[PDB]
Amino acid sequence: NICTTRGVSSCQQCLAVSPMCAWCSDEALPLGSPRCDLKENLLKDNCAPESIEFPVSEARVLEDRPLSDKGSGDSSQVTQVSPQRIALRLRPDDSKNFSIQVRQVEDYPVDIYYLMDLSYSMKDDLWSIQNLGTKLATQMRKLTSNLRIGFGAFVDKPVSPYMYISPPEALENPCYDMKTTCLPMFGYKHVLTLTDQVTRFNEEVKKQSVSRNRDAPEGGFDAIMQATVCDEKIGWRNDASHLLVFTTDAKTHIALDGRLAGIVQPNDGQCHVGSDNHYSASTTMDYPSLGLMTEKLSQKNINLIFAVTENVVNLYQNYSELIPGTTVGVLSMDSSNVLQLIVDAYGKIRSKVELEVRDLPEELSLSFNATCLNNEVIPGLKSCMGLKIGDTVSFSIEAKVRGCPQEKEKSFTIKPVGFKDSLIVQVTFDCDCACQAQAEPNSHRCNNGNGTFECGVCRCGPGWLGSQCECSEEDYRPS
């Protein structure tokens, strides 16, 4: 077998050969028997049961609270992932499997932040949404006991290629040549912090008005970033679904577009919204890239909804295909359907489960088999689709290690997209035999102090060879 045919040089080397191998660590074994073998062969050669030094993998659940039937009231006690913490033991080439189980709990809290394009074509929309808060709370009452709504608005960076800068009147009223009034241009502004006083949405929306800009693309991704990362400013709860509802009728600027304005500092993904609720870095820092937006949307557990008009639906579909936990819906040219658009998009955001993995060590890899509906199996897939609110799904996960890691313990997190319920895996590596606690260099027995202590058999320093270190290695001899 593989254990006996490689060199029996130490117990540590023997365990590194294959997951099947074991090592006899005391002198009762007959000389010429290979000390590294399958444990049953060490028992055939009468090795003592405590001497066989055979670690075997295990996966023990340290925290295992049951899945909740209701999202209402219980707050921090609501549980959507079945094992919360697991201890996992591995050895230098082995694999071990464990099961995670996930539920789309019903009547869970919801935070809706409404992020609105306020370019000049959006006046029909801004007139149509002026009573949206009480309509939205009336429909969402079917789906959640505990809704919060908030509001913010965007146009684009207030800088030369994008905003009107002559005549001087156009700085104060960008609509002067249209013989009407609109606001000075702004990049992003926060308006209403997430609140369950639903009438505040109706009050704050009636006080807004549009602005105007030169080119067709809008600065909306710069606003999605600040609505993501400014936690205490926006008001996102820990224990809720987060919906970021992004509305526009236009295409958008992207990272590296800011170079036409003389803006070349990369977006840092920090919060820059001040005491005046305006985004202060707007004129000095570039637009976000899709990878940086994807990172922050995942880090903050947000689900993004692109509510966009027919002339740009395919553009935002092809961006949605690059961002996890994201969807698109066809907005009316006056926002008159946005209520059903939010309610249907929340359904499309709960008809999935998909697993993120975080902090996974370079020595590990994972593979997933998904159960989904009707006790089926889909192999190799981190996802389920066609689900409903109230459904429960299972995944079987297998982890494998490549060699022995140099740190004996580490941890990593398995988590559904859009939730903070998670499974924490703690990994421990059994590359070492227990007898190594009794090791000694230049030890007694063996031969003339040339042997490191046995763990089962003497190990030589330089110049020497043999099972008691009894022969010099400088050339082969019988003595």
Contact pattern for other proteins over residues 417 through 456, marking x by CB under 8 A? ----------------------------------------
Contacts 24+ apart (CB under 8 A), 370-376: 370/394, 370/395, 371/395, 371/396
Please, which residue, 151 or 162, has the CB nearer to other proteins?
A: 162
117 is in an annotated binding site: no
How far from 224 is each of 112, 205, 309, 345, 363, CA to CA, in Å? 13, 19, 18, 18, 35
Q: How far apart are CA 24 and CA 354, in angstroms?
A: 46
214 vs 445, beta carbon nearer other proteins? 214
Q: In this structure, what token pair is assigned to residue 293?
A: 């937006």
Query: What is the C-alpha to C-alpha distance for residues 4 and 88, in angstroms, rounded to an integer?
Result: 28
156 is in an annotated binding site: yes
Residue 161 makes CB contacts below 8 A (sequence gap 6+) with 214, 215, 260, 261
Q: Does 315 bind other proteins (CB under 8 A)?
A: yes
Per CB under 8 A, 318 contacts other proteins? yes
Q: Is 361 in the site for other proteins (CB under 8 A)?
A: no
Instruction: Select from 30, 32, 66, 167 the one that contacts other proteins (CB under 8 A).
Output: 167
Which regions of 138-289 does DSSP assign to beta strands (E)?
A: 147-154, 188-195, 241-248
Exactly one of 76, 77, 216, 407 binds other proteins (CB under 8 A); which one? 216
Sheet holding 383-385, edge to edge: 58-63, 85-90, 423-429, 409-416, 352-358, 383-385
Q: Tell whether 238 is in a known binding site.
A: no
Sign of the dihedral defined by the CA atoms of residues 152, 241, 148, 315, in that order: positive
Shortest CB 432 distance to other proteins, Å: 28
The secondary structure element, H or E, covering residue 100 is strand 95-103
Among 165, 183, 313, 389, binds other proteins (CB under 8 A): 165
Check residue 292 for interaction with other proteins (CB under 8 A).
yes
Binding residues for Ca(2+) are: 121, 124-125, 156, 213, 215, 217-218, 249, 333
Binding residues for Mg(2+) are: 119, 121, 218
Binding residues are: 119, 121, 124-125, 156, 213, 215, 217-218, 249, 333
Given the rule CB under 8 A, which residues bind other proteins? 160-161, 165-167, 214-217, 251, 254-257, 260, 262, 264-266, 289-292, 294, 314-315, 318-319, 322, 357, 360, 365-366, 382, 462-463, 473-477
